A paper describes a structure:
The investigation of the structural details of the MDDEF mechanism was aided by the discovery of crystallization conditions under which the introduction of substrates and cofactors by soaking resulted in activity in the crystal. These MDDEF crystals were grown at a high ammonium sulfate concentration (1.6 M)19 but subjected to buffer exchange into PEG3350 solutions before soaking with ligands. The apo form of MDDEF (MDDEF-SO42−) has almost identical secondary structure elements compared with other MDDs. In the present structural study, the positions of two loops were determined in the ligand-bound MDDEF structures but not in apo-MDDEF. Other MVAPP-bound MDDs have stabilized phosphate-binding loops possibly due to crystal contacts directly involving this loop or the C-terminal insertion covering the corresponding β-strands in eukaryotic MDDs. In contrast to all other published structures, in the MDDEF structures, there is no crystal contact in the regions described above, which should allow the flexible loops to take up unrestricted conformations. In the physical mechanism, the phosphate-binding loop and the β10-α4 loop may be initially dynamic or disordered in an apo structure (left).
In the mevalonate pathway, the mevalonate diphosphate decarboxylase (MDD, EC: 4.1.1.33) is a rate-limiting enzyme, suggesting that inhibition of MDD could eliminate the products of the mevalonate pathway and accordingly shut down bacterial growth. The γ-phosphate group of ATP is transferred to MVAPP to make the 3′-phosphate-MVAPP intermediate, which is then subjected to dephosphorylation and decarboxylation to produce IPP. In this study, we utilized MDD from Enterococcus faecalis V583 (MDDEF), a VRE strain, and investigated the enzyme from structural, functional and biophysical points of view. Our present results suggest that the substrate-binding mechanism of MDDs involves programmed conformational rearrangements in and around the active site, including movements of the β10-α4 loop, the phosphate-binding loop, and three helices, α1, α2, and α4.
Numbering used by the authors:
A (entry chain A), B (entry chain A): 0 to 97, 104 to 182, 193 to 326
Amino acid sequence: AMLSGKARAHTNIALIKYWGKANEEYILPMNSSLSLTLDAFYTETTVTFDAHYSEDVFILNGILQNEKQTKKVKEFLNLVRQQADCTWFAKVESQNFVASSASGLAALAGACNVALGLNLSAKDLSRLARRGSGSACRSIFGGFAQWNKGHSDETSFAENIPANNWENELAMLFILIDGMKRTVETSSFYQGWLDNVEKDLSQVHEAIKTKDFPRLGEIIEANGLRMHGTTLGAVPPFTYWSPGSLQAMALVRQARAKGIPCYFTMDAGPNVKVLVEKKNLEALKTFLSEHFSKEQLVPAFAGPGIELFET
Amino acid sequence: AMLSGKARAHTNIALIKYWGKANEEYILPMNSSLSLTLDAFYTETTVTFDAHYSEDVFILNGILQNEKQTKKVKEFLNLVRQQADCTWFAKVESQNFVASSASGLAALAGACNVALGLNLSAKDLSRLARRGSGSACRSIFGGFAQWNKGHSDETSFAENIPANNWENELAMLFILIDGMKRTVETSSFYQGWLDNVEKDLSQVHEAIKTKDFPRLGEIIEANGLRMHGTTLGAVPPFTYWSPGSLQAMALVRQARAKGIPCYFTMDAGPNVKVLVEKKNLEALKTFLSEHFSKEQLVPAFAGPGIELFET
């Protein structure tokens, strides 16, 4: 008496940021977001629901996860079990291949979809993954994907953005180096963030249509910096940046000054991701090898959407 | 046929920032600001107006200044000459003792006041110095000073803030490591800056009245960070910070975590200034000597207002 399933999901980098929740219970965002799914980073997850299991068990990269490390997986298992009326405890085994939490929750959503026979469409699998993490709902799709904020659980989900395979000409170079809710609630800059998101989304779409890289890069770099500005207006104010983040951002500006179009974006931690055309990736690595070690510069290209496996 | 005068003016650190101009010609600010005048840093300036001079000459620390280095001094000389109906070229000799541009313009304003016999009140000398630089108008005064934005040339000036000599219990530790107009005009965060200034000023005044140091420190640290957030919303966005600025800010937070009340503020360059009570200054220097050299840690205490000298 057991049900099992497996999925592989790739991480994604938000180019137009998901920043702030309108609804905490359902993970409905304050604004729509847009990402690029990446080939280099992914999670493979297997789930087993078995009447003989006595508790939920989460193993990540061979290591048994403790309660706090299992908290998001357990809450997702409860959600999908309640949706399926399944009364069994589960064993989740994930292996990261190297944002990972998000790819992991996307993979778990697909694995549970398989195991419980939910037969979900891509849209409804995105809606399910959304309940685990917002970024996870975009990793259901490959290449460029947009999470549409929606007004509700039914209308908030992600879809792929057809680029005419422009995504296959791009690359990301990773430079290895409570706050969101605080910012929504207390930051005097949050409204300015909200007022600029839709214009940014529109111009990304116009840039994708014309394959205009400098336009794409300028928009997404300013979008990321606008997100980071908001935390300096929160009460109390904070930054996600580390000294190395600033060094890396300044070096990307230097790179552009030498005629390499490239553009940086950051998330909720100090690392810096650089968008560049495939042509210039190695030149950028060499330039940044002046101030950072080989182990700190990691390339990635466009990746696929979620892959489901019957067990 | 010559007229001469001399003044000494001390620099000041803005605790509630002057950020943005309402009027560029008259230097009327978008908001009121509040500073502490410091003992350690000052400029002494002598001016001579002489019918025999053939051009304006500016010597700074013994070195003849070129045209671009003389631009602000020359514009100030023209302003004060037009106000006095004086047709003579001038020789300005300034010596920095070690923000310096601002202390230098305050000192020049006092020296011209003496030389041309303007017999200005402190208020009117502040109004004159304001035409050279906004910060200069506060350095007319010692200790705590507030530049009231006013609506006009007549109403925009600075005044000392009586503290019951609380300023003599404080200290600043300096850690040595176009954008303003761009931010006013393009930043989606500038209105949030404006909406929070007056509340900050009110609480500084309440803190001074009760000599409440943690309250003063919390307000001014958040005020500075709010100013810096606005530049990340400018078009194009930018930061004044350098990697070392972030390291220093993080170390100040660590210092507080160990029970040393202290609070950081930054201006338009990478250096970091730390407000602390006199009692703890040396402890802070020792703590920061872990990551910075002796030449990078410079203490200062409360300084006096402008001093005028007949020549």
